[PDB]
Design brief:
The complex is a heterodimer of chains A (387) and B (92).
Chain A (H helix, E strand, L loop, with lengths): L3 E5 L3 E8 L2 E4 L9 E2 L2 E3 L4 E3 L1 H5 L8 E2 L2 H4 L7 H6 L6 E5 L2 E8 L2 E5 L1 H20 L5 E6 L5 H13 L3 E7 H8 L10 E8 L4 E9 L2 E10 L4 H20 L7 H17 L5 E10 L2 E8 H7 L1 H5 L2 H10 L9 E5 L6 H10 L14 H13 L10
Parallel strand pairs in A: 1-11, 11-12, 13-18
Antiparallel strand pairs in A: 1-2, 2-3, 2-4, 5-6, 5-7, 8-9, 9-10, 13-14, 14-15, 16-17
Chain B lengths: L1 H13 L3 H5 L24 H14 L2 H4 L5 H20 L1
Helix pairs in contact in B: 1-5, 3-5
The chains are: A alpha+beta (387), B mainly alpha (92).
The complex binds adenosine-5'-diphosphate (ADP), magnesium ion and sodium ion (2 copies).
One sodium ion (NA) binds next to loops of chain A.
Chain lengths: 387, 92
């Protein structure tokens, strides 16, 4: 039975397997090739993935996300103290270590970040087992290039708690390069830029690859820029619209705001392939149904600053790597948000019309490379060389 | 490079005989490798012995551990030949 590759993402996770000469990115039982990194605790059950994210509006204080922001950190870390303000769930200090505290089955319970992440990994394991019709034990799990030993070890520990044997922890941008077979090239060294705009974070990495050996030359980005921020720009737009139409302010109703955000994220996705999207919400606030439309043009405008701003970390990465933009051999799109046409246009214009690597679904690329690597490390991808 | 050539010649000469490879792997490891002890053919007779020694070997040359080390390329070459030799051994 095969080893699997798991992208354990800040906002979404994804599992692939290399089998019968091809990588399959595995759909969950709801039909989704990516699964929210969400865990909900209720009166009766623990919910993970789609079911967890889907009930966030009804149960916000016992629905945990963003565990990856806590993993491998100390409670007193500046990052943790800062991030805590944004979360509706409780974070507490246990002998210097952060724990999430929740209500579960009428009981107060607390979990370490690696325990929450193990629940996400368990779900991804189950997704793969459903597809394979056999148990999955071995996996490659990915992390950000900038993760330190503490964060890597905590991620491994999450795997162990999920009943997995972690063959290796590898870097997200490196996984994406592996997906495209970039480490199979021979001869002069090649410079690769990974442009990874996800749900919560934006990462730019410059890799040099020679004879299948990687070197991370520079990293840049913003740990607090992603798709969620584009959703929020839409949310504020529609809060204004509702107040003007109905003489009612929904801003302070937390459930209505979350219900609206869900609808905005769906419309945004539609706007990557269509030029308009429609929103329909039953009884959004005080019995009032909310129906409206938004254009691709209007969405782009609402996010204009955030989109063009993605080019600054690109410039910063290039100078830290001591490279001109004419010196980059391959550009790889990674992350769900890079499906946004305006993002793709901005990046290609920056590189003076050069073609982008986007044939692999950008939200699946990391899992894809992890799957390849897992097969190699298992002895299940002989020949060629070693990718 | 001489280290790569040394491994290529080792691989060709042993004919994917897993015992021949394991019994001589000490001759192709990088300088600075200190974990592996030379294994003699006496400790490679039974299939159980071969499996135990193979498992030890792959741990030494594992690409995950080798990532970023000066000897990375060479560990990868040894790892892949051992795996192929093991699969052939299992086919018997
Ligand atoms: N077709 C699409 N158009 C625009 N945004 C998308 C699309 N598909 C997914 N996204 C966004 O991608 C983000 C998730 O990115 P992903 O790379 O899947 O996860 P993560 O950032 O956790 O690794 C979410 O904000 C999601 O709304
Ligand atoms: Mg990601
Ligand atoms: Na992901
Ligand atoms: Na990212």
């Amino acid at each position: 039975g095969p080893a699997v590759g798991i992208d354990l993402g800040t906002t979404y996770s994804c599992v692939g397997v290399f089998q019968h000469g091809k990588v399959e990115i595995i759909a969950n039982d709801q039909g989704n090739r990516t699964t929210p990194s969400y865990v909900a605790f209720t009166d009766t059950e623990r919910l993970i993935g789609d079911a967890a994210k889907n009930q966030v509006a009804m149960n916000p204080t016992n629905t945990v996300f963003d565990a990856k922001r806590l993993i491998g950190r100390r409670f007193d870390d500046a990052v943790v103290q800062s991030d805590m303000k944004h979360w509706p769930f409780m974070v507490v200090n246990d002998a210097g270590r952060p724990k999430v505290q929740v209500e579960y089955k009428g009981e107060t319970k607390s979990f370490y970040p690696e325990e929450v992440s193990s629940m996400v990994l368990t779900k991804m394991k189950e997704i793969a087992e459903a597809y394979l019709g056999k148990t999955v034990t071995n996996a490659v799990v990915t992390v950000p290039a900038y993760f330190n030993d503490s964060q890597r070890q905590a991620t491994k520990d999450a795997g162990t708690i999920a009943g997995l044997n972690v063959l290796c922890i590898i870097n997200e941008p490196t996984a994406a390069a592996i997906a495209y077979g970039l480490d199979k090239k021979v001869g002069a060294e090649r410079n690769v830029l990974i442009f990874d705009l996800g749900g919560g974070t934006f990462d730019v990495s410059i890799l040099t690859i020679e004879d299948g050996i990687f070197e991370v030359k520079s990293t840049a980005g913003d740990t607090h820029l992603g798709g969620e921020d584009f959703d929020n720009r839409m949310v504020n737009h529609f809060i204004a619209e509702f107040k003007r139409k109905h003489k009612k302010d929904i801003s302070e109703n937390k459930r209505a705001v979350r219900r609206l955000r869900t609808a905005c994220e769906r419309a945004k996705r539609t706007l990557s392939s269509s030029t308009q999207a429609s929103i329909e919400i039953d009884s959004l606030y005080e019995g009032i149904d909310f129906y409206t439309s938004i254009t691709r043009a209007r969405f782009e405008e609402l996010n204009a600053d955030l989109f063009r701003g993605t080019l600054d970390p690109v410039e910063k990465a290039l100078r830290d790597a001591k490279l001109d933009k004419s010196q980059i051999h391959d550009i790889v799109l990674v992350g769900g948000s890079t499906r946004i046409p305006k993002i793709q246009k901005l990046l290609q214009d920056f590189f003076n019309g050069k073609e982008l690597n986007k044939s692999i679904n950008p939200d699946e690329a990391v899992a894809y490379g992890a799957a390849v690597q897992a097969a190699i490390l298992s002895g299940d991808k002989s020949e060629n060389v070693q990718d | 490079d001489p280290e790569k050539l040394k491994i290529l010649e080792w691989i060709e000469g042993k004919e994917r005989n897993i015992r021949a490879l394991l019994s001589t792997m000490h001759t192709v490891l990088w300088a600075g490798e200190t974990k592996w002890k030379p294994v003699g053919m006496a400790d490679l007779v039974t299939p159980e012995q071969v499996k135990k020694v193979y498992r030890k070997a792959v741990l030494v040359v594992h690409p995950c551990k080798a990532t970023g080390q000066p000897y990375e390329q060479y560990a990868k070459m040894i790892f892949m030949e051992l795996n192929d030799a093991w699969s052939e051994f299992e086919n018997q």
